[PDB]
Coordinates of N, CA and C in Angstrom, one line a residue:
X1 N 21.8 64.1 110.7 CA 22.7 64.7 109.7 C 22.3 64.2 108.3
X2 N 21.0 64.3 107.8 CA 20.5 63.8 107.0 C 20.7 65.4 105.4
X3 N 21.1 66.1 105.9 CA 21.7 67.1 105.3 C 22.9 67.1 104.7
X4 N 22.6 67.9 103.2 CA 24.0 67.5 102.1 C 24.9 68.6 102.6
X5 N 25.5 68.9 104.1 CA 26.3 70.4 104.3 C 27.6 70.1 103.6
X6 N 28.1 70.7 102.9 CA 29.6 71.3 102.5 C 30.4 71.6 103.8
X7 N 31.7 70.5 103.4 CA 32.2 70.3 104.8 C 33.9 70.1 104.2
X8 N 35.1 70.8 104.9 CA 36.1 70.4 104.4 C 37.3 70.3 105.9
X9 N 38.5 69.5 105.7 CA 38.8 69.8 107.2 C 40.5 68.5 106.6
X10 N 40.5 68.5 107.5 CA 42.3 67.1 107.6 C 41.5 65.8 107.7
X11 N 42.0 65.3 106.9 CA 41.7 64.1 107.5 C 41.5 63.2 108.8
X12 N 43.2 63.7 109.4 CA 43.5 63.6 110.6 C 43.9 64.9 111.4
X13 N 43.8 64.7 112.5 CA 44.1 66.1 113.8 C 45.6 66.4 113.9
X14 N 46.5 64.9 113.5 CA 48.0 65.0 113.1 C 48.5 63.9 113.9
X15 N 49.7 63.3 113.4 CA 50.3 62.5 113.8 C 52.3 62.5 114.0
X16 N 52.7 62.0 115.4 CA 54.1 62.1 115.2 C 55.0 61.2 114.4
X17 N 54.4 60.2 113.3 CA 55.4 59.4 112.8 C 55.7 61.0 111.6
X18 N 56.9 60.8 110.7 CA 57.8 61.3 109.8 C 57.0 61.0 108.9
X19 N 56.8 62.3 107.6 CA 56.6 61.8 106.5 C 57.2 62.8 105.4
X20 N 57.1 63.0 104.2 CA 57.9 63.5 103.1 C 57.4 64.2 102.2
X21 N 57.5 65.8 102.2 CA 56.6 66.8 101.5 C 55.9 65.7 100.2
X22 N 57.1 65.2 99.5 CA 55.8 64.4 98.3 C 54.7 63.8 98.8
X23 N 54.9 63.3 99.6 CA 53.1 62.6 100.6 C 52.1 63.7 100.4
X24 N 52.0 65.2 100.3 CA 51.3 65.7 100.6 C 50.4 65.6 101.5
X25 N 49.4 67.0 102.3 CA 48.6 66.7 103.0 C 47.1 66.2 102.9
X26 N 46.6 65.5 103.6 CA 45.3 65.1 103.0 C 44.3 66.1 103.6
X27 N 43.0 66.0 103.2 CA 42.2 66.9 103.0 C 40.8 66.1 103.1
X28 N 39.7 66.3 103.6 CA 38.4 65.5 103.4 C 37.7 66.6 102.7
X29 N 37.1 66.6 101.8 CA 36.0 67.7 100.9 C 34.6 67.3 100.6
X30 N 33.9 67.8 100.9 CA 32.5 67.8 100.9 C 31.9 69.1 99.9
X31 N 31.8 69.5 98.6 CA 31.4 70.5 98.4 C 31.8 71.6 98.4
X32 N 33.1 71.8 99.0 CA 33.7 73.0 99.3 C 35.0 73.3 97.8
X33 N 35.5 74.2 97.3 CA 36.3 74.1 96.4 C 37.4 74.6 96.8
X34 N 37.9 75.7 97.9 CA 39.3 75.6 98.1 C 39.3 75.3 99.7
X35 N 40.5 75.8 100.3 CA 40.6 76.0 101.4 C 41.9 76.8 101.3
X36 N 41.9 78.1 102.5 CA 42.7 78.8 103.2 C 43.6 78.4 104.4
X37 N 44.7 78.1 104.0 CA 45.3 77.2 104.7 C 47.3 78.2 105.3
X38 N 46.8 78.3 106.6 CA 48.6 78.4 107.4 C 49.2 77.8 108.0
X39 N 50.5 77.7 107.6 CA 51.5 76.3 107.9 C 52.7 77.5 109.2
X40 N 52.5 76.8 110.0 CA 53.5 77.1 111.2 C 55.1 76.2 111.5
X41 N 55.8 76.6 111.6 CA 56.6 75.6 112.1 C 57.0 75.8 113.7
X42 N 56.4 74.4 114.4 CA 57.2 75.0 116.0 C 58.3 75.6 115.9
X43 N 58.8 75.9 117.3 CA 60.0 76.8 117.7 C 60.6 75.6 118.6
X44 N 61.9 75.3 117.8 CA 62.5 74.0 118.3 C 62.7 73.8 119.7
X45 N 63.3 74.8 121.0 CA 63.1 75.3 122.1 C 61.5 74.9 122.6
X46 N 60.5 75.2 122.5 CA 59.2 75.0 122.9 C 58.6 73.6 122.3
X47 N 59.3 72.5 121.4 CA 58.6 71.7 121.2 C 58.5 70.6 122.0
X48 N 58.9 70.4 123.5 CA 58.4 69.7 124.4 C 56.9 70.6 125.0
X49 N 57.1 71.7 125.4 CA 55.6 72.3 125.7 C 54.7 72.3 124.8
X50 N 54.8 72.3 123.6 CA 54.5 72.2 122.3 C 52.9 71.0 122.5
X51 N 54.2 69.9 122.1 CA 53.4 68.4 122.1 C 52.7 68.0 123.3
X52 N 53.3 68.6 124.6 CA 52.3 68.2 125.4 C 51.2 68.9 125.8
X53 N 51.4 70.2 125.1 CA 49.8 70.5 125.2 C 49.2 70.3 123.9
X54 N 49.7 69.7 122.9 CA 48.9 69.2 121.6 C 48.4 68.2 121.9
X55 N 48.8 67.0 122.8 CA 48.8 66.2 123.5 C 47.5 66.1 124.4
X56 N 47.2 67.0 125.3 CA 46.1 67.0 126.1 C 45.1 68.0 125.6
X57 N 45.2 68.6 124.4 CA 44.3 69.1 123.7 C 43.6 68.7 122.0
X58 N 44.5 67.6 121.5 CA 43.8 67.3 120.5 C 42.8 66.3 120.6
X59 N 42.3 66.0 121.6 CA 40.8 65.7 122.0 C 39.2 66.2 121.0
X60 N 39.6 67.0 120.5 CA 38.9 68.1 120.0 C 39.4 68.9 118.3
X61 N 38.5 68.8 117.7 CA 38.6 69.9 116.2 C 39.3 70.8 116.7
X62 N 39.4 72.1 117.1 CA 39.8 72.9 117.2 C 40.8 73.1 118.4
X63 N 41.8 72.5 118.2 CA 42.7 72.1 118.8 C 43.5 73.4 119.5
X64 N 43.9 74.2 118.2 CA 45.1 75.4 118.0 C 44.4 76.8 119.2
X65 N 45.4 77.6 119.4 CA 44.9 78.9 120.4 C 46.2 79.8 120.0
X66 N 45.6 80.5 120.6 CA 46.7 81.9 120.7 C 48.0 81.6 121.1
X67 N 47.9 81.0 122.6 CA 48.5 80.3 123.3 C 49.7 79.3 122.9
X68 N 49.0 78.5 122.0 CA 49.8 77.3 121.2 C 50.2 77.8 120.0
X69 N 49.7 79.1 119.6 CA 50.7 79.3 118.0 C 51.5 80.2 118.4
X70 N 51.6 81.3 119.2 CA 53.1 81.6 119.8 C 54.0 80.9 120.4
X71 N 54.3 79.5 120.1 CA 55.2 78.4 120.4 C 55.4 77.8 119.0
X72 N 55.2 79.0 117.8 CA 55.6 78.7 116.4 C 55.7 79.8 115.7
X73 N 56.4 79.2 114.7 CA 56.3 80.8 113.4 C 55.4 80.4 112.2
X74 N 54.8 81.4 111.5 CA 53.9 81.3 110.4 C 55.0 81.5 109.3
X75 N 55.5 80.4 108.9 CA 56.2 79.8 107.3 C 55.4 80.4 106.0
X76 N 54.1 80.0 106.0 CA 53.2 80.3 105.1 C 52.1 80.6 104.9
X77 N 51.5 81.1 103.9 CA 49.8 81.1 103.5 C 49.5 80.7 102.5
X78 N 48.9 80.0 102.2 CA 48.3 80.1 101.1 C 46.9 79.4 100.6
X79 N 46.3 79.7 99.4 CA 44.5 79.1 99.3 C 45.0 78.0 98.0
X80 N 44.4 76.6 98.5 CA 44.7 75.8 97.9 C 43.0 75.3 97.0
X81 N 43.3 75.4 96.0 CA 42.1 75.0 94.7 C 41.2 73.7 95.1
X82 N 40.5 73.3 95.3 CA 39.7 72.0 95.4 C 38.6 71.5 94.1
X83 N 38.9 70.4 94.1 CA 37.8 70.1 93.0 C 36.7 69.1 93.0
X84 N 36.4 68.4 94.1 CA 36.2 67.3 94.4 C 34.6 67.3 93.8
X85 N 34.2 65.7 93.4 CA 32.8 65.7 92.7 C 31.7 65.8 93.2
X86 N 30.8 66.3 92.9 CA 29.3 66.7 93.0 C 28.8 65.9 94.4
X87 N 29.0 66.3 95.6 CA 28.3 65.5 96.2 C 28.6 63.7 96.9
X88 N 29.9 64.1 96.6 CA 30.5 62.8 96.6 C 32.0 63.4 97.9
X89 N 32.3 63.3 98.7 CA 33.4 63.1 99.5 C 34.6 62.6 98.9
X90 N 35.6 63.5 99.0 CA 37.0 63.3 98.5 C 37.9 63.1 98.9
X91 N 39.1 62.4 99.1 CA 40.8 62.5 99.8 C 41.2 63.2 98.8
X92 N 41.6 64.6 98.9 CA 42.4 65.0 98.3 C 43.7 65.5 98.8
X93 N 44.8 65.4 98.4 CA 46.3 65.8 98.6 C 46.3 67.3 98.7
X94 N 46.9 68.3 99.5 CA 47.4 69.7 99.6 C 48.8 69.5 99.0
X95 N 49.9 69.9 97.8 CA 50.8 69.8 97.5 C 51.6 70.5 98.5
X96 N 52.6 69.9 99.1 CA 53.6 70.6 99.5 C 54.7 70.6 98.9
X97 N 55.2 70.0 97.9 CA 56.6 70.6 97.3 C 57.3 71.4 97.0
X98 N 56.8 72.6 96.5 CA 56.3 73.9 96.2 C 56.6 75.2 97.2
X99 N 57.0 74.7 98.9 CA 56.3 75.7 99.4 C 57.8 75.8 99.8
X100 N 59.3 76.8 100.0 CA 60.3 76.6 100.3 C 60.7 76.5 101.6
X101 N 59.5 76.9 102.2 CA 60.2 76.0 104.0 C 59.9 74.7 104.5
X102 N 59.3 74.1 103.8 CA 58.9 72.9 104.0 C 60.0 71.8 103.5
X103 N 60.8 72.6 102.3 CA 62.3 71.8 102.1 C 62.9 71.4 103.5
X104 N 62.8 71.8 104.7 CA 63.3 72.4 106.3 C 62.7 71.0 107.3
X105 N 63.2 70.5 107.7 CA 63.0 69.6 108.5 C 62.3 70.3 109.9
X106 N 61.2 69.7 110.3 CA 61.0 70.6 111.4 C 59.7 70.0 112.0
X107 N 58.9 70.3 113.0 CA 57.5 70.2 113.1 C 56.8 71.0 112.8
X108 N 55.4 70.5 111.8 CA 54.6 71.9 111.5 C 53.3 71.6 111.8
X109 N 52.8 72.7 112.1 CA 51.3 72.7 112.0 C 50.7 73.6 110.6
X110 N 49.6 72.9 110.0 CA 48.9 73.9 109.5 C 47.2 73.6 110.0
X111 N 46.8 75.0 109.4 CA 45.3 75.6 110.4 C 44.4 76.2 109.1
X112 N 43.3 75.9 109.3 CA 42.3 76.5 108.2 C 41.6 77.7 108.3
X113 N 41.8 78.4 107.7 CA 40.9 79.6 107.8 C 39.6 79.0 107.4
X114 N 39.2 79.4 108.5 CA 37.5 79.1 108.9 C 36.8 80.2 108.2
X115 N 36.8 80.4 106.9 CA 35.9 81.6 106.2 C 34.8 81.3 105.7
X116 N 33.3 82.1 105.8 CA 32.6 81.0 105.0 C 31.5 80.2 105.9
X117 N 30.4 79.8 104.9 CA 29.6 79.0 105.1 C 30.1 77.2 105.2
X118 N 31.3 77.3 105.0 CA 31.5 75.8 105.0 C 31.9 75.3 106.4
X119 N 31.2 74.1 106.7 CA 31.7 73.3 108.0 C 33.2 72.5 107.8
X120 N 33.8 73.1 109.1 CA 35.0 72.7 109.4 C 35.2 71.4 109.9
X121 N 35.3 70.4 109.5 CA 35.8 69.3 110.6 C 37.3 69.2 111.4
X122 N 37.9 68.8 110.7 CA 40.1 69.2 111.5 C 40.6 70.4 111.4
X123 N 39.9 71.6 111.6 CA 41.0 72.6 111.0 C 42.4 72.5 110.9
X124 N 43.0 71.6 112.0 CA 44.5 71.7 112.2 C 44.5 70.5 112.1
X125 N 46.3 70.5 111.5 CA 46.9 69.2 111.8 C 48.5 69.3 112.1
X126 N 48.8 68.2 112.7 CA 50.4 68.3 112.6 C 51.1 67.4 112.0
X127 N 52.2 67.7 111.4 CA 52.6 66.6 110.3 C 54.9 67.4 110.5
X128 N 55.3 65.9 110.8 CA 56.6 66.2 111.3 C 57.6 65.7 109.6
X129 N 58.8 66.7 109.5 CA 59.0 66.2 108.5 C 60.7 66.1 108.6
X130 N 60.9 65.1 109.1 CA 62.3 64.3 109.7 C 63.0 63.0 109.0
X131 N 64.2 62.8 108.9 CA 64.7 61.9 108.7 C 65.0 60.7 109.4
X132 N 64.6 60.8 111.2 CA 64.6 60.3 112.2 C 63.7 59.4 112.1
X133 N 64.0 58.3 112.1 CA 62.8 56.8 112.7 C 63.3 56.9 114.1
X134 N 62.3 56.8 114.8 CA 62.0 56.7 116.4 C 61.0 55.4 116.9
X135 N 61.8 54.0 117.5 CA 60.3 53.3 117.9 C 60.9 52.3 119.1
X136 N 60.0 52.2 119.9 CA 60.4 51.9 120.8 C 59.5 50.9 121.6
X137 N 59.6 49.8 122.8 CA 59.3 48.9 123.5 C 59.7 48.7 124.6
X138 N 59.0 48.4 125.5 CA 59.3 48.2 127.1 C 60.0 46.3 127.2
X139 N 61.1 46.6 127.6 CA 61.1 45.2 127.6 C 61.7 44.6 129.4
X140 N 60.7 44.2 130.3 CA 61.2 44.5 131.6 C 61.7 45.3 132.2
X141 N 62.5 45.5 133.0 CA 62.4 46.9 133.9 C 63.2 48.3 132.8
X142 N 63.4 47.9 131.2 CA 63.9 49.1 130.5 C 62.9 49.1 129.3
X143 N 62.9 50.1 128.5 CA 63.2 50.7 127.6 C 63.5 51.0 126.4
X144 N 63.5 49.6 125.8 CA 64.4 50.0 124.3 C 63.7 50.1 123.4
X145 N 64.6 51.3 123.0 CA 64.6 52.2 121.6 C 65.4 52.0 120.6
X146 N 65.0 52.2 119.3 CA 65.8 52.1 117.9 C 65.9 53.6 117.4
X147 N 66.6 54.0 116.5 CA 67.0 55.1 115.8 C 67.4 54.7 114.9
X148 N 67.2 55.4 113.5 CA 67.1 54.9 112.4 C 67.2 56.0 111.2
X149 N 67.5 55.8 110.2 CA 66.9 56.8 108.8 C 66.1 56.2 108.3
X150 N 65.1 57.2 108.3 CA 64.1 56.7 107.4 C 64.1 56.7 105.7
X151 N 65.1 57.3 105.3 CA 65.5 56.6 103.7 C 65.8 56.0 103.5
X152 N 66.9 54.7 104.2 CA 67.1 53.6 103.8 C 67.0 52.3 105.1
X153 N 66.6 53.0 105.9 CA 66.4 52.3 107.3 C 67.4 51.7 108.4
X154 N 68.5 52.3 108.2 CA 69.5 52.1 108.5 C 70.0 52.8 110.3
X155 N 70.4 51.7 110.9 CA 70.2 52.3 112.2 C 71.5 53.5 112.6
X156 N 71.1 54.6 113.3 CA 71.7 55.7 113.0 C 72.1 55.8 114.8
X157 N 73.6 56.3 115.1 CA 74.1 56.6 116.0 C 74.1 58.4 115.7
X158 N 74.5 58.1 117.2 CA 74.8 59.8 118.2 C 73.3 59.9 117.9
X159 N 72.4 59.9 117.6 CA 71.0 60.6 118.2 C 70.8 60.9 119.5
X160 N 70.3 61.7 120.2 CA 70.2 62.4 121.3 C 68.6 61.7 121.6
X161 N 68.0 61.1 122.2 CA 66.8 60.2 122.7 C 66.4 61.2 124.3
X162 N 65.5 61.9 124.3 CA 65.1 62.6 125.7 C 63.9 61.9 125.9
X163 N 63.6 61.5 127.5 CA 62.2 61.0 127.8 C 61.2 62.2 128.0
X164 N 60.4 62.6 127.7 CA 59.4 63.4 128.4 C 58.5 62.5 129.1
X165 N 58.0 63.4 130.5 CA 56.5 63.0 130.7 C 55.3 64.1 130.0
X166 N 54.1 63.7 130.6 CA 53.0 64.4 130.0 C 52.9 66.1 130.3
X167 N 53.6 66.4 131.1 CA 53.8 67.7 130.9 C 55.1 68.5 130.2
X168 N 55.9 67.4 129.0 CA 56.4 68.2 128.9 C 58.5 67.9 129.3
X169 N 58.5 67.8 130.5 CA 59.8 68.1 131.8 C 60.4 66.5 131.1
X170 N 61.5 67.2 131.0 CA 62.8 66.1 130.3 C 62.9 65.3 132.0
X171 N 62.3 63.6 131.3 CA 63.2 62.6 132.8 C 64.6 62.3 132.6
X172 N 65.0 62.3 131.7 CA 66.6 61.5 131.2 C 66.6 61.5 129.7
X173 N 68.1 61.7 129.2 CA 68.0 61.6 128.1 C 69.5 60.8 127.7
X174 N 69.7 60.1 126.6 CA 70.9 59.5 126.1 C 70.7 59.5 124.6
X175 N 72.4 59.0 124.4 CA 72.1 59.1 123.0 C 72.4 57.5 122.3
X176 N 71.9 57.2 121.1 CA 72.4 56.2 120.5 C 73.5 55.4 120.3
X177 N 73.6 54.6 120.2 CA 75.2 53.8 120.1 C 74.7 53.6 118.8
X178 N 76.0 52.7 118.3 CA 76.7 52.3 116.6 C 75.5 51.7 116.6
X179 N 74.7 50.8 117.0 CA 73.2 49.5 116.7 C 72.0 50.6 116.4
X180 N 72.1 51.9 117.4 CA 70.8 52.7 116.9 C 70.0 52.4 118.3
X181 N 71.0 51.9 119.0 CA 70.0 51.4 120.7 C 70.5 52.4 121.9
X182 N 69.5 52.8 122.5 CA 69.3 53.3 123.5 C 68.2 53.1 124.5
X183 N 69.0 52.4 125.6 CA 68.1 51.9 126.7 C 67.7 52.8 127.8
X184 N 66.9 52.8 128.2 CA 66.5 53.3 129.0 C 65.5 53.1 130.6
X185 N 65.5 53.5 131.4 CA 64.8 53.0 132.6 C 63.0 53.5 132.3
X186 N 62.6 52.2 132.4 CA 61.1 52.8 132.9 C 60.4 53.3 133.6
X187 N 60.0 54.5 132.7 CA 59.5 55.4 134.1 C 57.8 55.2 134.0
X188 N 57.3 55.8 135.3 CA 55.6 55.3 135.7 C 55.2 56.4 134.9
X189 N 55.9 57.7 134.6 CA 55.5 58.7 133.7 C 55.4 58.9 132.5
X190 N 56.6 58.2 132.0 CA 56.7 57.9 130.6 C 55.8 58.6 129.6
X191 N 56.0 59.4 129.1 CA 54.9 59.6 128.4 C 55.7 60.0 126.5
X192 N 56.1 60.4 126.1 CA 57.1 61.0 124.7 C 58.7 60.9 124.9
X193 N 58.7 60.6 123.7 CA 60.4 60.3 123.1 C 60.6 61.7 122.2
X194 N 61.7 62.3 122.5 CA 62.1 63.1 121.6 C 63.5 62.9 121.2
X195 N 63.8 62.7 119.5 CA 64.8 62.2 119.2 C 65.3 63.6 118.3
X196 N 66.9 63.8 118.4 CA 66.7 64.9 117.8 C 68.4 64.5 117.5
X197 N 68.9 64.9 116.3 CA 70.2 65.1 115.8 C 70.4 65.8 114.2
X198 N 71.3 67.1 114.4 CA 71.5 68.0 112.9 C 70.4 68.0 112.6
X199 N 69.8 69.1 113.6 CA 68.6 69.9 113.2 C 67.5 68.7 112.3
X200 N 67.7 67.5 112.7 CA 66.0 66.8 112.5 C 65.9 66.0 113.8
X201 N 64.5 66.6 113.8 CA 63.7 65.9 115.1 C 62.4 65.1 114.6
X202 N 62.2 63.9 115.6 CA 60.9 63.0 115.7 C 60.7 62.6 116.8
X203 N 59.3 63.1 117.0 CA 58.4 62.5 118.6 C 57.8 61.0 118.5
X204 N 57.5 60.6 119.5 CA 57.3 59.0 119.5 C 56.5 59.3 120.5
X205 N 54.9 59.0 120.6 CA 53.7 58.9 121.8 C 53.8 57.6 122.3
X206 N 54.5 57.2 123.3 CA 54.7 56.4 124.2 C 53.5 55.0 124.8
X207 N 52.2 56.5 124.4 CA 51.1 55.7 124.6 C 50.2 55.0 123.8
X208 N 50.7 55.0 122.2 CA 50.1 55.1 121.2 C 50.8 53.6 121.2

């Protein structure tokens, strides 16, 4: 790869911690000056099928299918400007402030239009945008979990905490007490936490 190819893509493939449209999205740029870019938001109903097959398919660039974006709706489009220097590799930020469904708590994916002579590295990524802190530890034969806001860190009751395994299928679920704790039994399946209360949700990779 001794070749100067023009290459642009995510930084990352996506991640379940929470973060906050000002974060904006990152971007790697190689020579390329925009990118064509659609933001999806799952379908709250399908975001257990969702993440577990995001789950056993983000192994790979090209993560997204037919398959997995009818378990979402297309929020947006749009071609975002790139400027990055001569030959030199860039982090640049995708603004999302700007875009009015992203005000919307929710899980989203966005996907690159692959137009063009330019090489794609991440087309997709996923990026959750919640008020929920979700973190959790095994501590002998349970399970404990925290719940939290993430604006001031403050541990947050009545959250609704569901176990998934890797495909997906709810093992048990409970909700938070007044501390933000919910214990739980360990299972050999274990695989995702889904925390969800007033329409904001956050996943937690169990294995991560």
């Amino acid at each position: 790869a001794m070749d100067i190819q023009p290459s642009v893509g995510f930084a990352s493939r996506g991640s379940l911690l929470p973060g906050k449209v000002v974060e904006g999205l990152p971007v790697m740029a190689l020579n390329v000056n925009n990118v064509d870019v659609n933001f999806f938001r799952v379908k709250p109903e399908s975001l257990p099928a969702f993440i577990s097959q995001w789950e056993y398919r983000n192994s790979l660039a090209n993560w997204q299918s037919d398959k997995l974006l009818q378990m979402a709706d297309l929020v947006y489009t749009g071609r975002f400007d790139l400027n990055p220097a001569r030959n030199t590799r860039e982090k640049l930020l995708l603004p999302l402030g700007d875009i009015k469904p992203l005000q919307q708590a929710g899980v989203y994916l966005a996907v690159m239009n692959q137009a063009g002579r330019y090489d794609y590295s991440n087309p997709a990524t996923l990026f959750t945008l919640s008020d929920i802190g979700v973190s959790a530890h095994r501590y002998h034969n349970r399970l404990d979990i925290f719940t939290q806001s993430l604006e001031n860190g403050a541990a947050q009751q009545g959250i609704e905490v569901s176990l998934l395994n890797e495909k997906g299928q709810t093992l048990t679920q409970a909700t938070s007490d007044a501390q933000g704790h919910v214990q739980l039994e360990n299972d050999k399946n274990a695989a995702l936490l889904l925390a969800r209360k007033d329409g904001q949700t956050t996943l937690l990779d169990l294995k991560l």
